[PDB]
Amino acid sequence: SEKPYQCDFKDCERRFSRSDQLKRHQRRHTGVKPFQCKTCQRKFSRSDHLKTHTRTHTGEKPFSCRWPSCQKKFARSDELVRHHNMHQ
DNA sequence: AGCGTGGGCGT
DNA sequence: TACGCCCACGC
Ligand SMILES: [Zn+2]
Ligand SMILES: [Zn+2]
Ligand SMILES: [Zn+2]
Structure with a gap:
């Protein structure tokens, strides 16, 4: 497994197999939050995390105990x- | 508990 | 680039 996409931020040595993965990681350094909830206006670093966040507003619970x-x-x-x- | 928010990864 | 997962720590 080769990881050509390296983080060069101060004191960071993380490397990744994908460029989008590196860019996603780097948001933890910059504090950038590109994705905003249209209901409560909170902003998020990641679109998948915005997506699950929005379920807080509807109470949608797709995962049932068996x-x-x-x-x-x-x-x-x-x-x-x-x-x-x-x-258990 | 509920969920923020990193990690990983498939398509 | 986009969309979407599972993993799993920490509050
Ligand atoms: Zn970094
Ligand atoms: Zn919201
Ligand atoms: Zn149960």
């Missing part, structure tokens, strides 16, 4: 992972 008799559901897959882990 445990018998459990009615819990979640906005994000990782919430469901943590929840299923908890059921």
